[PDB]
Design a protein around this ligand. Structure first.
Ligand SMILES: CCCCCCCC(=O)OC[C@H](COP(=O)(O)O[C@@H]1[C@H](O)[C@H](O)[C@@H](OP(=O)(O)O)[C@H](OP(=O)(O)O)[C@H]1O)OC(=O)CCCCCCC
Ligand SMILES: CCCCCCCC(=O)OC[C@H](COP(=O)(O)O[C@@H]1[C@H](O)[C@H](O)[C@@H](OP(=O)(O)O)[C@H](OP(=O)(O)O)[C@H]1O)OC(=O)CCCCCCC
Ligand SMILES: CCCCCCCC(=O)OC[C@H](COP(=O)(O)O[C@@H]1[C@H](O)[C@H](O)[C@@H](OP(=O)(O)O)[C@H](OP(=O)(O)O)[C@H]1O)OC(=O)CCCCCCC
Ligand SMILES: CCCCCCCC(=O)OC[C@H](COP(=O)(O)O[C@@H]1[C@H](O)[C@H](O)[C@@H](OP(=O)(O)O)[C@H](OP(=O)(O)O)[C@H]1O)OC(=O)CCCCCCC
Ligand SMILES: CC(C)CCC[C@@H](C)[C@H]1CC[C@H]2[C@@H]3CC=C4C[C@@H](OC(=O)CCC(=O)O)CC[C@]4(C)[C@H]3CC[C@]12C
Ligand SMILES: CC(C)CCC[C@@H](C)[C@H]1CC[C@H]2[C@@H]3CC=C4C[C@@H](OC(=O)CCC(=O)O)CC[C@]4(C)[C@H]3CC[C@]12C
Ligand SMILES: CC(C)CCC[C@@H](C)[C@H]1CC[C@H]2[C@@H]3CC=C4C[C@@H](OC(=O)CCC(=O)O)CC[C@]4(C)[C@H]3CC[C@]12C
Ligand SMILES: CC(C)CCC[C@@H](C)[C@H]1CC[C@H]2[C@@H]3CC=C4C[C@@H](OC(=O)CCC(=O)O)CC[C@]4(C)[C@H]3CC[C@]12C
Ligand SMILES: [K+]
Ligand SMILES: [K+]
Ligand SMILES: [K+]
Ligand SMILES: [K+]
Ligand SMILES: [K+]
Ligand SMILES: [K+]
Ligand SMILES: [K+]
Ligand SMILES: [K+]
Ligand SMILES: [K+]
Ligand SMILES: [K+]
Ligand SMILES: [K+]
Ligand code: NA
Ligand code: NA
Ligand code: NA
Ligand code: NA
Lengths: 328, 328, 328, 328
C-alpha cells in the first residue's frame, strides 16, 4: 500500500501546480547543486565556451577597427597584437590568456592603448567565474548526506515483555570505524484520524516517547544498539490487542541525526515500518562475541529474530488484572 | 500601522547615533560581506588596480636607478629586464608576472641582484590578496539565507474549537524536493504593557507554547503542516472574547530555523500577524490527494479557508460553564 | 581586585609548568592559527624560501653530474636544460617552474631522462604546499570570533521591584543590520565557599536561572533587550539585605552565544560584574521612539539609569511580612 | 581485562563479516579521507600520472594520423603542433599544457582543427581533478578531531561525602589559551545484566545524572573543573558498600563535546574508568594560586589526591540511620 516513506528513505510526494516559479531563480545556487551530474557538466562547458567566445569576439573587433588587418604584410607599423589576423587566432589568444597559459607565439605590445583595460576586465571576470564554477563543483562533491548510505537500520521491529512492561523494540547499527558525533534518534506515528466536530485530517503526525525526558536518547554508537519504547498510559498503543493489531492501518517513521567526523556537517537517516513488520512476541539474537581482548560483531545475525512466549492482551488489561490481584 | 516586522521578513528599525564607529573597521570581513554587489565589484577592481600600479612603479624605479634607460641602444651591457624602457612596459611586466601568465617577450636575467628578492615579495603578496579576494567572493555567493526565499508561510491564521479546546492555528509549507534538517519552530507575542509600579515598556516579548515541553515542535517537514497552539490557563489569550478581539493591539511573530541539506549551514525564516489576520471561527482546506501510489499536493488551496460554527466566549467562560454543568 | 574576567572578555589566567609539550606538535594546525600575524608571515616566507632553495639545489646537482657545465660552449651536444650554467640560473628556473610562470628563455628538452620524474615531484609538492599555506591564511582571515567586537553589553546592572517580586536586571544590544541566528544567553555566579567537612574550594561556579525551564531564554534580538532574573527561594540571593550587599565578595559572569548570518559558524561574547556594579533601586531609560513608520533607537541613553523608590529588605523578609499580613 | 574503551579513546571492536561492500564505493569521499597518508599520496600521484599519460596518448595519436611524422623535415606544410615528433615530446606538451605552465618552445597553430576541442576538454578535466584532489587534501589536513589531543582528563576518580551526601567526582582540564565554545559533558554506565524473563544482554548502557535537569552541565571551561554526580535514589549506586565495591564488574564512560574556536567544527573526547580507579574516601588537591593580579595553575598536582575520613556504608543505609535518628 501507499507507504508515504520508502524502506530506504525516498519519499512519495509530487509537488505540482506552483505559480510563482521565479523563486527558483532567486537562489540559483541551490538549484545548481540539486541537479544531476549530466546537466552540471553541460552547464560547466556551456558557460566556459560562451565566456571564451564573447571575449574572442571583442578582441577580433578591437583589431579590425584599428586597421591591423589591412597591413598584415608590412615590417613597420607595429600592430596591437602579434600574429593575429584570422578569427581563429583571436579565439586562441583569448583561451591562452584567460586560463593563464601564455605560450608566447602571439604577444601584446605597448603601443595599443585600451589593450590594458581589456586585459584587466578579462582577468577579473575569469577569476570570478573560476571560483564560482570550482566552488559549485567542490560543494556538490563533498556533501554529507552520502554518509547515510552506510548507517544500517533493522528489519521488522518486535513487541515483547520486559520486567512486566510491554515494550516495542527495534535495532540500529553502524558500518565503519569512524564516529557519529552528537547522534540522536526520534520516532513519529503517522495515521489518519477524525476529530469530534467533523474535520477530517489526511495524515496526522504524533511523537513517540523514546527517552526525551531523561536525556536517554543521546546514544553513544559503537556496536549495534536496540532502541526500546515502553508502552505506558501516554502511548498511542495503550489499547491494542494481539488480534486487533492487523486490523489497524498506521505507520511508524524513525529518524536518526548526527554529525560526520571528518567534516563538521550534519547527516540524517530515515526508515519506516507499516503494519506487516510489527511482529508480536519475538526477540533479537545476540551479535557480540569476546575473543582475545577484542569484541567481534557478526552482522550475519543482524536481522535474525527468534520466537518466545508472551501474553496476548492490551497493556490496559494487564494493568487491571495486576491491580485487582494486588487488591485481593 | 507600524508592524515592527514586515509580512516577508524585513524589520523596520533604524540604528542611529552611534559614537564608536571604529568597531566596523575591527571586523572588516563582515562589513565587506554585508555590502551590495555594486560596491563589492568596485572594491575588487580598485584593490587589483592599486596593487598592480604600486609594483609597476617599484619596477620602473629599480630600473631607472640601475641606469638601463641610458644604454637602451647597445648590444652589450646586459640589462636587468629585457625590452623594458617605457613606463608602460613595466606595468605590462608587472601584470604578466603577478597573474602568472608570463608571455616571454620580456624576461628577467641572472645578472641583476635584488630582482629575485622583489619577485619573491610580489609572488607572496599576489597569492595572499588572491585568496582574500576569492574567498570573500565565494563566501558572498554561497550564503544560506537565500534558501529562506522558498519556505512558504501561510495567510491569516485561525482560531477554532478542537476536542472541546480552543486552539489557534496556522500553516507552513515547503517548496522543493530537498530536506530541511533539524527544523524547529517558535512563536512570540509582542505587545506593550505597563507594570504595577509605574514603569512603561515600549514593546514586550513573551514566548507562546507550541510544544516545547513534550518535544513536539521538532517537526518532520514533507507536506504542508498545520501548527496549533492550545489555549490554556497559561496562555496570554486566557481572557479574550469574540467581540473584544478587534479592540486589542498586539502582534504574533513566528520563526522557523533549520539546516540546509547541500551545505551544513543554518537558515531562518520569519513572519508576523497583527490583528486583522486572526479570523475567528474558520478552518483550512485539505490539500493532499492520493493517485496511483503517489500523494499529490495542490498549492492552489494553500491559503483558501472556509467557515464553520463556533461558540463566542473566552476560554475562561467555557471552563466555568463546563465545571458548573458537571457539578450539577 | 582580581576579577577572573576582564570587563571586555579577556581572562586572567596563566597556564604554567606543563611537562608533555609534544602535544602542541600533534595538532600543528591549531598552533599555526593561534599565533599572531608577525610570525605567520615569517613562517610563510621561510617555508616558500626553503622549498625553492632545495629544489634549485637538486636541479643544480642533476646538471653538474650530467656534465653540461663542461660543454657550455658547443653548438651540438644538446644539454638537459637550456641556458642553465650558473647556480643562480637554476634557482630562477625552479622559481619559474614551481609558481607556474614559465617565461621561456630557458626550457627543458626531451633528451634528458629523469627530468620528467623531477618535474612531477616538484609540481605535486608545490600544489600540496600551496593549499596548506593558502588554507591556513583564509582560515585565519575568516574566523567568526571577530563579530563579538560588535555585540554591546550594558553597564552596572540593577536590582528592583516588579509586580511584588525582587528582580535583577541588565541590558544587551546589537550593532548591525544583520541577525544573530539561534542566539541564547546564560549566567553563572562565581564565589569561593567552604563545605561543612573542611574542604576549601578556591572558586565555585553555580548557574543562575534566566528562563531555561520555560524556554524563555532563546531570545529574538533586534532592539536593545533587558534580561531579568527573578529572585525566588532557589536563587543564591534569597538572603541579602541592602546594607549587607557591599559586605560580600562575589562575581556574576554573563555569556551570550549565537551563529553568524553570513557564514554558519558560532560566536560567543562574555562579560562580568563584580560587586560595585550592582546598584540597588534603579531603572533603565527607554530608548525606542516612533517616527513616520519606523522605530528609532538612541544609543546615547544605552547606559543611562535613573533612581526610584524601593524597600530595603531581603526577599525572605518580604515573604514573611506578606504571609503574616495575609494570615491576619 | 577487556575494557571496551582504552584509557585514551580508542575502542576495541572489530567489524567483520560484511556482505554488501559496494556501500564503501557509494560514498568514496569518506573512504578517501579515512585512509592513512602513505596511501593518500600514492593515490594522488597515480591519478595525476594516469591523467597525464592518457592525454599525451591522445595527442600522439591525433598527430600520427594527421601525417605530421612523415614530413618532419620540410619548411612548408605547417603541422598541427610545433616540434612534436617523438612520443616523449607529446607527454611533455601535455604536462606543460594541463598544469598551466606553457614554456613556449612547442606551440599550437591555427590550421589544425579539433585541436581547440581537445584543448577545451583537457582544460576542463584538469580543473575538475585539481579541486577534487586539493579539496580532499585540505579537508584531511584541517580536521577538528586533532584538538582532542590537548583536552586533559583526570586519573582514577573518587567517592566522598559532601554536605551529608555521597558523591562521585572526577576532574577535567584544558591546555590552551583558546576556548571550547558550547562545551558539554555526559557519562554512561556499561555493565552486563540479565532480565527477569531469561533474556541476556552482553553490554547495557545507562545514563548517569550529571546536571541535565537544572542545565548545570553546560560548563564554562577556563581552569581545571571538578565534575560531581550526587548519589540519590535514582542512581545505579544506590546499594553499594565499601567492601562490596571490588566485588562488582562495571565501567564508567565519560564524554565531552564542544566546538573549536578557530573554525566552527565539533570535537569530542572520551575516557573510561573500570573498577580499580574508583578510590573510596579521598579528595583532590587545590591547583589555583593568586599572584599579583593573576591566577597561576600548577598542573603538577593535577592528578595528586590525598586521603581523609569517610563512613563505610551504602547510601541507603545512611538514609535509614538518619531517618530513624530524626524520628527518635
Ligand atoms: C559521475 O557519475 C554519474 C553520472 C550519471 O549520473 P546520473 O545522470 O544517473 O545522475 C545521478 C543519478 O540519478 C543518481 O541516482 C542520483 O542519486 P540518487 O539515486 O538520487 O541518490 C544522483 O543524484 P545525487 O547523487 O547528486 O544526489 C544523480 O546525480 O555519470 C555520468
Ligand atoms: C549581480 O546582481 C545584482 C546587481 C544589482 O544588485 P543591487 O545593486 O540592487 O544590490 C542588491 C539589491 O539591493 C538586492 O535587493 C539585495 O537583496 P535584498 O533585496 O536586500 O534581499 C542584495 O543584497 P544581498 O542579496 O547581498 O542580501 C544587494 O546586493 O547587479 C549589478
Ligand atoms: C595585519 O595587522 C596587524 C599586524 C600587527 O599585529 P600584531 O603583531 O599586533 O598581532 C596581533 C595583535 O597582538 C592583536 O592585539 C591581536 O588581537 P587581540 O588584541 O588579541 O584581540 C591579534 O590576534 P588575533 O587578531 O589573531 O586574535 C594579533 O595577531 O601588522 C603587522
Ligand atoms: C606525514 O606524516 C605521517 C606519515 C606516516 O603516517 P602513517 O603511515 O603512520 O599513518 C598515520 C598513522 O597511522 C597515525 O598513527 C594515524 O593517527 P592515529 O594514531 O590513528 O591517531 C594517522 O591517521 P590520522 O592522523 O589521519 O587519523 C595515519 O595517517 O608519513 C609518511
Ligand atoms: C567528457 C566530459 C568531461 C565533458 C563533456 C561530457 C558531456 C558532453 C556529455 C557526457 C554525458 C552526456 C549526456 C548523456 C545524457 C543525456 C540525456 C539525453 O537524453 C535525455 O535527455 C533523456 C531524458 C533525460 O536523460 O533526463 C540527452 C543528452 C544528454 C543530456 C548528454 C549531454 C552531454 C553529456 C553530459
Ligand atoms: C563589468 C564588471 C565585471 C567590472 C566593472 C563594473 C563596475 C565598473 C560598474 C558596474 C555597475 C557600476 C555601478 C552602477 C551603480 C552605481 C551607483 C551610482 O549612483 C549612486 O551611487 C546613487 C546611490 C546608490 O546607488 O546607492 C554611482 C556609480 C555606481 C557605484 C557604479 C559603479 C561602477 C559599477 C559597479
Ligand atoms: C612585507 C611582507 C608581505 C613580507 C615580509 C614582512 C616581514 C619580513 C616583517 C614584517 C614585520 C616584521 C616583524 C616586526 C616584528 C618583529 C618583532 C621584533 O622584536 C621582537 O620579537 C620583540 C618580541 C615580540 O615582538 O614579540 C623581532 C622581528 C619581528 C619578528 C619582525 C619579523 C619580520 C616581519 C614580520
Ligand atoms: C615524496 C612524496 C611527495 C611523493 C612520493 C612518496 C611515495 C612514493 C612514498 C612515500 C612513502 C612510501 C610508502 C612507505 C610505506 C609503504 C608500506 C610498504 O609495506 C607495506 O605496505 C606493509 C603493510 C603496510 O604498510 O600497511 C609498501 C610500500 C608503501 C605503501 C610506500 C608507498 C610509496 C610511498 C607512499
Ligand atoms: K556547523
Ligand atoms: K561549517
Ligand atoms: K606561461
Ligand atoms: K599559471
Ligand atoms: K611562456
Ligand atoms: K617564448
Ligand atoms: K550546531
Ligand atoms: K602560466
Ligand atoms: K573552501
Ligand atoms: K544544537
Ligand atoms: K529540556
Ligand atoms: Na563506528
Ligand atoms: Na521537501
Ligand atoms: Na540586528
Ligand atoms: Na582555555
Amino acid at each position: 500500500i501507499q507507504r508515504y516513506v520508502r524502506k530506504d528513505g525516498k519519499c512519495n510526494v509530487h509537488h505540482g501546480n506552483v505559480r510563482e516559479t521565479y523563486r527558483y531563480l532567486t537562489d540559483i545556487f541551490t538549484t545548481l547543486v540539486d541537479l544531476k551530474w549530466r546537466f552540471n557538466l553541460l552547464i560547466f562547458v556551456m558557460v566556459y565556451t560562451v565566456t571564451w567566445l564573447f571575449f574572442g569576439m571583442i578582441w577580433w573587433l578591437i583589431a579590425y577597427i584599428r586597421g591591423d588587418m589591412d597591413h598584415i604584410e608590412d615590417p613597420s607599423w607595429t600592430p596591437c597584437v602579434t600574429n593575429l589576423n584570422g578569427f581563429v587566432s583571436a579565439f586562441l589568444f583569448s583561451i591562452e590568456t584567460e586560463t593563464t597559459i601564455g605560450y608566447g607565439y602571439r604577444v601584446i605590445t605597448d603601443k595599443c592603448p585600451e589593450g590594458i583595460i581589456l586585459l584587466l576586465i578579462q582577468s577579473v571576470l575569469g577569476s570570478i567565474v573560476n571560483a564560482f564554477m570550482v566552488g559549485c563543483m567542490f560543494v556538490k562533491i563533498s556533501q554529507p548526506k552520502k554518509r547515510a548510505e552506510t548507517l544500517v537500520f533493522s528489519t521488522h521491529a518486535v513487541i515483547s515483555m520486559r520486567d512486566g512492561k510491554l515494550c516495542l523494540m527495534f535495532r540500529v547499527g553502524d558500518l565503519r570505524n569512524s564516529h557519529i558525533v552528537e547522534a540522536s534518534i526520534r520516532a513519529k506515528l503517522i495515521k489518519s484520524k477524525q476529530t469530534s466536530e467533523g474535520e477530517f485530517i489526511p495524515l496526522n503526525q504524533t511523537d513517540i516517547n523514546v527517552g526525551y525526558y531523561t536525556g536517554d536518547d543521546r546514544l553513544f554508537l559503537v556496536s549495534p544498539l536496540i532502541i526500546s519504547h515502553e508502552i505506558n498510559q501516554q502511548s498511542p498503543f495503550w489499547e491494542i490487542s494481539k488480534a486487533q493489531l492487523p486490523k489497524e492501518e498506521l505507520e511508524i517513521v524513525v529518524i536518526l541525526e548526527g554529525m560526520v567526523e571528518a567534516t563538521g556537517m550534519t547527516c540524517q537517516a530515515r526508515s519506516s515500518y507499516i503494519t506487516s513488520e510489527i511482529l508480536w512476541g519475538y526477540r533479537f539474537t545476540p551479535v557480540l562475541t569476546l575473543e582475545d581482548g577484542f569484541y567481534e560483531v557478526d552482522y550475519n545475525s543482524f536481522h535474525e529474530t527468534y520466537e518466545t512466549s508472551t501474553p496476548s492482551l492490551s497493556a490496559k488489561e494487564l494493568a487491571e488484572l495486576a491491580n485487582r490481584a494486588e487488591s485481593n
